Design a protein around this ligand. Structure first.
Ligand SMILES: N[C@@H](Cc1ccc(OP(=O)(O)O)cc1)C(=O)O
Length: 157
């Protein structure tokens, strides 16, 4: 009857309210966090947490590699209406780079996501959270109705 510790596809409003409910805004950055299905890249996981320094929710994507869960390629900074041509020119190269890296990354991550549903992959997720310095005590646990339906996480309890 155990509930996975991974959230399914939850919306941005709900992400913010879950972090606030668990007092993320009176605790250090990453002391409170949740783990959820990536909405953009199926097979990836996204860690959402509160950044005290910028007063915003931030998100970090992880994917399966042969070594276990690892950080996914990070996208460039979003375009802004004030961007100079120099910013825009750099964005072009960085986006192409991100797209090529992410494509290779998901090609491997999605295959591992599919083959090993009965998985010792769970321990490597805990390892990568520790490397990122997420306080494991501050993990927000989904309720049954909000937990991920993906079979890879059935035993992520
Ligand atoms: N905000 C992140 C990118 C990001 C955005 C959304 C996100 O969630 P999802 O996987 O559901 O798209 C994860 C990561 C960054 O700029 O590095």
């Amino acid at each position: 009857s155990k509930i996975p510790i991974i959230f399914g596809l939850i919306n941005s409003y709900q992400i913010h309210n879950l972090l606030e409910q668990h007092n993320a805004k009176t605790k250090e950055s990453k002391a409170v966090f949740l783990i959820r299905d990536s909405s953009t890249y199926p097979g990836l996981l996204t860690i959402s947490y509160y950044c005290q320094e910028q007063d915003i929710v931030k998100h970090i994507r992880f994917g399966l590699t042969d070594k276990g869960w690892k950080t996914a390629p990070k996208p460039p900074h979003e375009p802004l209406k004030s961007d100079s041509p120099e910013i825009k020119e750099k964005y072009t190269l960085d986006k192409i780079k991100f797209e090529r890296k992410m494509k290779q990354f998901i090609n491997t991550a999605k295959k591992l996501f599919e083959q090993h549903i009965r998985a010792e992959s769970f321990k490597t997720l805990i390892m990568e959270l520790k490397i990122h310095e997420f306080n494991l005590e501050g993990l927000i646990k989904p309720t049954r109705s909000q937990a991920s339906q993906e079979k890879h996480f059935t035993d992520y309890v």
